[PDB]
Symmetry: D2
Subunit: 111 residues, 4 copies
């Protein structure tokens, strides 16, 4: 697994489950191409987005649909989504996000 | 101001000075139109981006150029930038502070919204 | 001031108002002596804790009573409080801002230190 | 495992390895008793601190020796340590901390 995603809920102290995540790669023409997507699991994780063959060097955007997550909990959140944009330049990338209605934090663990 | 940005540096324990910030507003045709830009001051703050008249309802993107910040200090960071996307003024005018706390492989952002 | 505390609420997107804060200083005998206390204002800030004269070198503990904050709002949070422990003024006088961003099961803290 | 700890490094985007962690329980007399300790692994994790038998309801303090971690990297950090103080009131508790020289963040994931 070259790329994983993890999402936590800072209000409830739980994984953030069933959160939609879309990944994009920047194309030559400077636009974003759909690359991979999924929903976080019961553990707040999304594995199997890509393979090491397909995950070549490039600029990637990971978009986390935080607004839907909070709306489902009856909470009016601030952000439309959380985006994480980074260059992958070669082994394993974990993109983690910790969510609150008016705040989020993200870190990369690269091993 | 109705829109202020504040950026802090978690490595140095200081304001993040001279960080470029670009603000965009989503246009009728669903593209991001330039709205305002600036750089953070010696206090890590950026004021004067817009007026209450021009800051109408809409979806705004605040892009904080964190990579240029860390590279100007000679560090190779993870992220290209930090983006904060939000709907503004949809229940009348509010004042927004977007705060960001930066490290080379992590950032945090919060919003303080007052009426 | 040489010591200020600022607290924000990540659930409401607001300053965290009326948060109790107790500051202690490590004594010669290795126990925590009361140094100062107060509550955050409507802006989430707490000033006037100490003077540059009284804020000598030492190890300080800033305890932010986050549990009392969340319970006063009727939420059951995880932490008892948030503690920030640091050595101060060991290379001469500095001004310290301790900032905290609060959620029921998480908090973040940073320091801004200026000369 | 009723209690785990995890530590990440926000500067380098890596687990924080070989970080000393001490756990304490509040005794009747309102003092802190040593309860458990260890060093984080290569994955930045500390498992096997306690058993479900021994991890009864009570107030616990988890102290993370962040100052030594940064000092070993040639970095002068702000905090003496990071402390996480909480009541355990019954299944599984993960205490995570994300570290920078002048900042740290901590969350509890309770499942
Ligand atoms: O200067 C402020 O008002 C301020 C300082 C720091 C933070 C902050 C943050 F942006 C992320 C995480 C933790 C923080 F305290 C928020 C606001
Ligand atoms: O268990 C993890 O992988 C994990 C836990 C917590 C965090 C995190 C974060 F993404 C931002 C702020 C504080 C945290 F502990 C990151 C990763």
């Amino acid at each position: 697994c070259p790329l994983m995603v993890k999402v936590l809920d800072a209000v409830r102290g739980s994984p953030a489950i069933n959160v939609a995540v879309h990944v994009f790669r920047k194309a030559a023409d400077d636009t974003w191409e759909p690359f991979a997507s999924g929903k976080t699991s019961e553990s707040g994780e999304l594995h199997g987005l890509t393979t090491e063959e397909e995950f070549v060097e490039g600029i990637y955007k990971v978009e986390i649909d935080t607004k839907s997550y909070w709306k489902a909990l009856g909470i009016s959140p601030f952000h439309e989504h959380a985006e994480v944009v980074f260059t992958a330049n070669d082994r394993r990338y974990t993109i983690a996000a910790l969510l609150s209605p008016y705040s989020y934090s993200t870190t990369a663990v690269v091993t």
